[PDB]
Enzyme design. Sequence first.
Site, PDB file in Angstrom:
ATOM      1  N   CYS A  46      80.227  24.657  62.390  1.00 54.84           N
ATOM      2  CA  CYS A  46      79.423  25.021  61.422  1.00 54.84           C
ATOM      3  C   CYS A  46      79.330  24.073  60.394  1.00 54.84           C
ATOM      4  O   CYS A  46      80.495  23.379  59.834  1.00 54.84           O
ATOM      5  CB  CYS A  46      79.632  26.340  61.004  1.00 54.84           C
ATOM      6  N   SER A  48      79.296  24.359  57.131  1.00 52.57           N
ATOM      7  CA  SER A  48      80.358  24.419  56.024  1.00 52.57           C
ATOM      8  C   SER A  48      81.761  23.881  56.415  1.00 52.57           C
ATOM      9  O   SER A  48      82.689  23.463  55.366  1.00 52.57           O
ATOM     10  CB  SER A  48      80.808  26.101  55.796  1.00 52.57           C
ATOM     11  N   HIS A  51      81.652  20.511  55.004  1.00 55.54           N
ATOM     12  CA  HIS A  51      81.593  20.432  53.646  1.00 55.54           C
ATOM     13  C   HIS A  51      82.936  20.042  53.280  1.00 55.54           C
ATOM     14  O   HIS A  51      83.232  19.129  52.407  1.00 55.54           O
ATOM     15  CB  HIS A  51      80.992  21.740  52.961  1.00 55.54           C
ATOM     16  N   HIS A  67      85.758  28.701  61.086  1.00 54.96           N
ATOM     17  CA  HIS A  67      85.812  30.204  60.828  1.00 54.96           C
ATOM     18  C   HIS A  67      85.127  30.831  61.773  1.00 54.96           C
ATOM     19  O   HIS A  67      84.946  32.196  61.627  1.00 54.96           O
ATOM     20  CB  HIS A  67      85.251  30.189  59.370  1.00 54.96           C
ATOM     21  N   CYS A 174      79.709  33.597  62.478  1.00 56.00           N
ATOM     22  CA  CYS A 174      79.077  33.042  61.212  1.00 56.00           C
ATOM     23  C   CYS A 174      77.547  32.715  61.609  1.00 56.00           C
ATOM     24  O   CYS A 174      76.614  33.559  61.091  1.00 56.00           O
ATOM     25  CB  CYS A 174      79.642  31.559  61.004  1.00 56.00           C
TER      26      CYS A 174
HETATM   27  N1  LIG Z   1      61.876  19.330  53.064  1.00 51.66           N
HETATM   28  C1  LIG Z   1      62.355  20.061  54.375  1.00 51.66           C
HETATM   29  N2  LIG Z   1      61.209  20.695  54.771  1.00 51.66           N
HETATM   30  C2  LIG Z   1      61.240  21.534  55.914  1.00 51.66           C
HETATM   31  N3  LIG Z   1      62.121  21.408  56.744  1.00 51.66           N
HETATM   32  C3  LIG Z   1      63.316  20.632  56.274  1.00 51.66           C
HETATM   33  C4  LIG Z   1      63.345  19.832  55.207  1.00 51.66           C
HETATM   34  N4  LIG Z   1      64.492  19.210  55.210  1.00 51.66           N
HETATM   35  C5  LIG Z   1      65.219  19.608  56.123  1.00 51.66           C
HETATM   36  N5  LIG Z   1      64.424  20.362  56.841  1.00 51.66           N
HETATM   37  C6  LIG Z   1      64.886  21.080  58.124  1.00 51.66           C
HETATM   38  O1  LIG Z   1      65.788  22.136  58.043  1.00 51.66           O
HETATM   39  C7  LIG Z   1      66.580  22.374  58.943  1.00 51.66           C
HETATM   40  C8  LIG Z   1      67.917  22.105  58.547  1.00 51.66           C
HETATM   41  O2  LIG Z   1      68.847  22.911  59.495  1.00 51.66           O
HETATM   42  P1  LIG Z   1      70.007  22.310  60.117  1.00 51.66           P
HETATM   43  O3  LIG Z   1      70.351  20.786  59.480  1.00 51.66           O
HETATM   44  O4  LIG Z   1      69.970  22.041  61.521  1.00 51.66           O
HETATM   45  O5  LIG Z   1      71.126  23.240  59.799  1.00 51.66           O
HETATM   46  P2  LIG Z   1      71.354  24.905  59.765  1.00 51.66           P
HETATM   47  O6  LIG Z   1      72.797  25.250  60.327  1.00 51.66           O
HETATM   48  O7  LIG Z   1      70.390  25.504  60.645  1.00 51.66           O
HETATM   49  O8  LIG Z   1      71.295  25.275  58.299  1.00 51.66           O
HETATM   50  C9  LIG Z   1      72.214  24.723  57.368  1.00 51.66           C
HETATM   51  C10 LIG Z   1      71.838  25.067  56.078  1.00 51.66           C
HETATM   52  O9  LIG Z   1      71.765  26.665  56.059  1.00 51.66           O
HETATM   53  C11 LIG Z   1      72.443  27.247  55.290  1.00 51.66           C
HETATM   54  O10 LIG Z   1      72.931  28.541  55.699  1.00 51.66           O
HETATM   55  C12 LIG Z   1      73.715  26.145  54.982  1.00 51.66           C
HETATM   56  O11 LIG Z   1      74.292  26.379  53.622  1.00 51.66           O
HETATM   57  C13 LIG Z   1      73.101  24.841  55.111  1.00 51.66           C
HETATM   58  O12 LIG Z   1      72.331  24.667  54.016  1.00 51.66           O
HETATM   59  C14 LIG Z   1      66.189  21.346  60.313  1.00 51.66           C
HETATM   60  O13 LIG Z   1      65.345  21.894  61.087  1.00 51.66           O
HETATM   61  C15 LIG Z   1      65.458  20.429  59.214  1.00 51.66           C
HETATM   62  O14 LIG Z   1      64.563  19.658  59.720  1.00 51.66           O
HETATM   63 ZN   LIG Z   2      79.702  28.924  58.810  1.00 47.22          ZN
END
Ligand SMILES: Nc1ncnc2c1ncn2[C@@H]1O[C@H](COP(=O)(O)OP(=O)(O)OC[C@H]2O[C@@H](O)[C@H](O)[C@@H]2O)[C@@H](O)[C@H]1O
Ligand SMILES: [Zn+2]
Lengths: 374, 374
Positions: A46, A48, A51, A67, A174
């Site tokens: 994940c 996090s 991070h 986790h 998670c």
């Molecule tokens: N400006 C934007 N507009 C629309 N979609 C966007 C934008 N920027 C990024 N995205 C989309 O948002 C998604 C981001 O999700 P992932 O990078 O795949 O990660 P995910 O695990 O799904 O989410 C992580 C995020 O969620 C929170 O719970 C966590 O803290 C983290 O910030 C992708 O599909 C990406 O294309």
């Molecule tokens: Zn997590």
Amino acid sequence: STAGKVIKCKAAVLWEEKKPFSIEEVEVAPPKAHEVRIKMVATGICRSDDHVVSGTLVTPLPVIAGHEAAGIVESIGEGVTTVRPGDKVIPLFTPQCGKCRVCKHPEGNFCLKNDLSMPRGTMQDGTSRFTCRGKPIHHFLGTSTFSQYTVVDEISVAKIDAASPLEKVCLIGCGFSTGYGSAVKVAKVTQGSTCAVFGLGGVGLSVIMGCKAAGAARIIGVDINKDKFAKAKEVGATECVNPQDYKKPIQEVLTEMSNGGVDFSFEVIGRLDTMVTALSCCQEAYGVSVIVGVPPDSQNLSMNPMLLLSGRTWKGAIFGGFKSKDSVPKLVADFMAKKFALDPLITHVLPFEKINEGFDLLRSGESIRTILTF
Amino acid sequence: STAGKVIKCKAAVLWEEKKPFSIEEVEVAPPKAHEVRIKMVATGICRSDDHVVSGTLVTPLPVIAGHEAAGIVESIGEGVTTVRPGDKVIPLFTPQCGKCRVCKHPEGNFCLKNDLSMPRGTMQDGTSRFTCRGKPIHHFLGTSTFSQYTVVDEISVAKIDAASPLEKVCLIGCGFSTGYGSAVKVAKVTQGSTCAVFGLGGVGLSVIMGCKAAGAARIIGVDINKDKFAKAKEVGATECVNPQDYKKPIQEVLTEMSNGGVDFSFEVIGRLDTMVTALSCCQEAYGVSVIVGVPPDSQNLSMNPMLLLSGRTWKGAIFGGFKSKDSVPKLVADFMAKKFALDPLITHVLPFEKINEGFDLLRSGESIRTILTF
Ligand SMILES: Nc1ncnc2c1ncn2[C@@H]1O[C@H](COP(=O)(O)OP(=O)(O)OC[C@H]2O[C@@H](O)[C@H](O)[C@@H]2O)[C@@H](O)[C@H]1O
Ligand SMILES: [Zn+2]
Ligand SMILES: Nc1ncnc2c1ncn2[C@@H]1O[C@H](COP(=O)(O)OP(=O)(O)OC[C@H]2O[C@@H](O)[C@H](O)[C@@H]2O)[C@@H](O)[C@H]1O
Ligand SMILES: [Zn+2]
Ligand SMILES: [Zn+2]
Ligand SMILES: [Zn+2]
């Protein structure tokens, strides 16, 4: 023969920031009172955990992250009663001490005995159950699942169904519960409603399913990557909007489609601006927007409070708002029921020794979810 | 003899911005279909009427303001059925068309047929029921109660108890219901809980009563004017904190007192910073903060979204979240019951001709509430 003493296995240790994981040999001390020792069968990777690597999420180093996983109980310490060796389990990054101000609250779930607020990177007694060579290695949350063996406290472990495919249900640790819970427990989606989900990632996909289980009638998934649109549709989204093709702000094109605005909006990306945008595409008089995630290094967002004055609600939550120890087990029972599927989420399964490769897939790219098998 | 035709009375007209009210002679046309003509017995002076004056709250001028009042029905137009002449009533600035997307929603109350979103300053048919000399004068909201007579639409009037002291219950028209409702309907205060109210004004005082009726167990009222602390205590606050005597941020001194933070916080001042402060003195895992008011000319506030992620909720609402036509009548019934008192709120009663004097008391000072009698 067995264990009731120190174990020696390999674990992925982070000695320094922004350095890869070093697969090392560590010693895992026996469980003290109310601790449980678990042999990991699989752990997911994940954002996090990553991070931590960046120094964004600040916890004591060196450490043993992870986790999101499931495993099997090897040995239990004194006074343990919820698990027995041989039991399938899931380590809980959000405990359930079951007696704090928050555990006792009918809605609260962020147990006071958690370790992200002010991370210590220890066990409940303030000592570490790990060492590499002669050096103690810190715990991550109360899990540290990127090890073949780990020790967790009894309020940080959930006993699950003994028939549970641990290579798939590790998700409930998670990723899946975080999204799914946001819909069904935090926003408390009602059936017939219209929902919008910003971010079509893994957690994102999870929300669309909760919205679906919830009974929703329309689920618009929005992302600027046309590529993510198929699984989302396959898993539940009725629509998929790419804000990049419109010539106008999508909060606008969103309110137009929803004829007033959606009933519930979810921001599962973690972007500030998108945070505000999702707030405004929600029906002004009774719309509810939920933040599923905000990066550990997030700054302040600019917002006009008149947005709330009409009647809108803004919530947040950790672990899908679920009371960890009480609910994890039920999510499995439901998964077992044939209720929901977890497969469209797992996009990659790698052997645990190839962890850093897992992070690469993650760090830059598309790997909805990478599961590390031990 | 009576009326079924044009009336001539005095009304307080605003011809220009930041100019006093001019008591003029106006003509009040008879009620068209589904309109109601009311003879005002008393109207309160609220901050929002004053915004109009400043140009902060932008509505078509000249206009006849006021929206917090009670009166008696003089004549009813065609198709009217909820009121009969002679009936005590209260004009509703937040209608209840009773059939929109919001009126039909179990929680929604910001009827779509309101006139603050995009003010027109007319009746539902888009014409004005007022003229001074030869010039049409615009309506305020759907009330314009700073006139000896006014015409309102049937979805903007509430029939109340015929025994109702109209010089006191006029409060239920804005001030009192706005605060009281925020506690009992919007935050949905639970008994035994701890509440904090920022702003010890009139609406502020109203919240402390809702919190009390609600069953709360501790009500900290906070204001930087020691002077407001007695009535608040008298009306319900168990504590009163003046952030000016502490040597530390009161969100801090607040969380310390509440041992984790209050269950519900209310910002009834309308300040941006205080908006954020009230958000943070709320229990992190399950705290609920409500914004009772934000000035019509409010800018964006800076906030860290991690505040919501723990599990906190942020709501807003207009008219105490109450379904206007359904609830106003009940607030009176409860007031009549001996339930709550409205007297500690009325601090001044002036003859309607001295309106501008009422605004002075208001504009700069302490006059919890000034009631204008006709
Ligand atoms: N400006 C934007 N507009 C629309 N979609 C966007 C934008 N920027 C990024 N995205 C989309 O948002 C998604 C981001 O999700 P992932 O990078 O795949 O990660 P995910 O695990 O799904 O989410 C992580 C995020 O969620 C929170 O719970 C966590 O803290 C983290 O910030 C992708 O599909 C990406 O294309
Ligand atoms: Zn997590
Ligand atoms: N920084 C501050 N900290 C604490 N209290 C403050 C501060 N600034 C002002 N106050 C207090 O807040 C109160 C303001 O209320 P009033 O001026 O008396 O007006 P009221 O009608 O009670 O509230 C009006 C406000 O509420 C909203 O519904 C409305 O939009 C408006 O913004 C006063 O008791 C004042 O001392
Ligand atoms: Zn607890
Ligand atoms: Zn309506
Ligand atoms: Zn008002």
